[PDB]
Each structure stands twice: as structure tokens, then as C-alpha cells.
Amino acid sequence: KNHPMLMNLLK
Amino acid sequence: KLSEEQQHIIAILLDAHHKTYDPTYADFRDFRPPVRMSPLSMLPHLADLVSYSIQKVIGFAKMIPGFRDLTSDDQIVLLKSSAIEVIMLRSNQSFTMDDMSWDCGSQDYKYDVTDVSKAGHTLELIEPLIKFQVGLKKLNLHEEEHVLLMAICIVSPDRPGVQDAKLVEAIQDRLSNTLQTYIRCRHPPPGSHQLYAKMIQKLADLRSLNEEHSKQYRSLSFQPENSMKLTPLVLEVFGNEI
Ligand SMILES: CC1[C@H](O)CC(=C/C=C2\CCC[C@]3(C)[C@@H]([C@H](C)CCCC(C)(C)O)CC[C@@H]23)C[C@H]1O
């Protein structure tokens, strides 16, 4: 885990 | 006939694709340039191409009706496992059977079997990939079916790591039923012959492509000098065990 870029693009 | 919700879903997915797939490929100017003379000379250009494509895949995914009702963790799992598959699927729009290549507007941005080789990949992936592209072309999908397929691909309950499988399944079934109904109501025979089943089969092809891509990417990225040529988003999504 730790997926900060994917997360950001999601919201 | 198609219900109003089903028409709604179709209209949403069409728009979501139009907003995330630029058919002039104008953004390709921002990528590290392609070099065709090994060195793996096509890896910086294609790494950027895939990286860009992940962002677009995410943009499309967020607009899938029901997708927003999932937890952010499950959103993450679905995107991490499907991204390579939807890139291969969406790439069919640029793919051409004239010469078995992906034609993105110009000679610089035309990618053939050997360009993909020059990114660290073997025929073990490239041959089934091309075959996929051909089988998919030959379905002659309506744009409506294409966008439904990419959506159904993303919202797949069996993906490793999924928590609320039931909710992902319900979201998929709704899209699935929209596809089946669209085929019966708007796709004329003969082209519609066993079309759903042939589309579900393409999703099975994608699972193998996904696996094979994972193996070659794993091997490609272990080597710190190749990994150096990737983007941070590609490392995050595909992996960074180097
Ligand atoms: C922008 C858009 C256009 O249709 C162009 C396009 C093409 C996709 C291609 C042709 C080049 C090779 C691609 C990028 C495939 C290779 C196997 C991916 C390699 C990625 C990597 C080196 C990071 O392992 C997947 C799908 C193929 C993507 C699609 O998103």
C-alpha cells in the first residue's frame, strides 16, 4: 500500500 | 428496448471517454521523444505514453456510474489491477490492421512490434497482444460497446484485494445488463452474433495479457537502470520492487 498519486487522481 | 437508466449510463460513459481520449493525440508532444536506432531506446517514450494513459484511465474510471460509491481502497485495487488491461483495450482505437501497428497521427507516434520490443518486452507478450488487437478490431464494436467494455473491465469483483465484492458485482451487473440490452436493441444481426460472449472472452484474453505484462515488467523494473527510465506513477501503479 501507500498509493498517494493514484489516490490524488481519484479525488 | 433500453431503459432510461441504461441510456443514461451509455451517455455518461461516451462522454467520459470523449473527455479522456483525445483522438488527435496532441499531448504526445510532451512525452520524452521516441528513439529508433539493446539500449531499450523506446522505453522513455512508451513509459510516458503508458503513464499518461494511466491518468486518463483513472479519469474515465471516476465517471463510471456507481464507481464513486466504492471505498477509496477498492477504487485503488480495481485501478491497480485493471489499468494495463484498459490501456490495451483503449489502444484498439489507434490500432490498425493495415500494418499491425498503433497509429497515433504521425510516423514518430506509430508503434509497431519492434518499438514495443525496444521497450523491454518479448514476443511472449507482443504476439498475443497483437492477436488480441486483431480479434478486438474484428468485432467492429460500436463506440457504446467499447466504453461499456472498458467499464466492465475496471469494475471486476474477482480482482485480488477486493473487499466489498458484492457491491463491485452489483455495479458490474448493471453495466453488464446495459451491454446485453444494448446488443439486443441496437446491434443488428449478423454482427451481433454471440457478441456479448465474444466481448467477455476478450476480458479473459486481457487477464493473460495482464499476467504476462506483470512478469515482463517485474523483470524489466528489477534492473535499476530501466526503472530509472520509468515515471513515478508507473512505479506506483505497476510496481517498484527494485
Ligand atoms: C493514448 C492511447 C493510444 O491508443 C495509443 C496507445 C497505445 C498502446 C500501446 C502501443 C505501444 C505499446 C503498449 C504501451 C503496450 C506495452 C506492452 C506496455 C509497456 C509498458 C511498460 C514498458 C511500462 O511495461 C500496452 C498497450 C500498447 C495507448 C492509448 O491509451
CATH number of the domain at B123, please.
1.10.565.10
SS3 category, B122: coil
Angle between helix axes B195-222 and B72-90 (nearest 10 degrees) is: 100
Chosen from B76, B154, B163, B240 to mutate, greatest number of chain A CBs within 10 A: B76
Angle at B121 between CA B112 and CA B150, to 5 degrees: 70
Alpha-carbon distance of B174 to B183, in angstroms, equals 14
- Cβ atoms within 10 A of the Cβ of B32, count? 14
- Cβ atoms within 10 A of the Cβ of B144, count? 20
Q: State yes or no: cis peptide before B160, omega within 30 of 0.
A: no
CB contact under 8 A, A10 and B62: yes
Alpha-carbon distance of B156 to B177, in angstroms, equals 14
CB contact under 8 A, A6 and B55: no
Domain span holding position B36: 1-242
Contact (Cβ atoms closer than 8 angstroms) between residue B167 and residue B69: yes
Return the C-alpha cell found at B87: 490501456
| Residue B90 known to bind ligand | yes
| Residue B101 known to bind ligand | no
Choose one of B51, B53, B127 to mutate for the ligand 1 pocket test, by most ligand atoms within 8 angstroms of C-beta: B53
Q: Which residues contact B232 (CB under 8 A, 6 or more apart)?
A: A5
The residue with cell 505484462 is B213
For residue B125, give the ligand 1 atom closest to its CA.
Answer: 17
C-alpha B19, offset from chain centre: 16
- For B:63-92, CB contacts with A below 8 A are 72, 75-76, 79-80
SS3 category, B11: helix
Does residue B49 have its Cβ closer than 6 Å to ligand 1?
A: yes
For residue B95, give the ligand 1 atom closest to its CA.
Answer: 4
- Nearest CA to B48 out of B34, B63, B69, B67 is that of B34
Count of structural domains within chain B: 1
β-sheet bridge partners, residue B111:
B102
Contact (Cβ atoms closer than 8 angstroms) between residue B129 and residue B208: no
Alpha-carbon distance of B44 to B228, in angstroms, equals 9
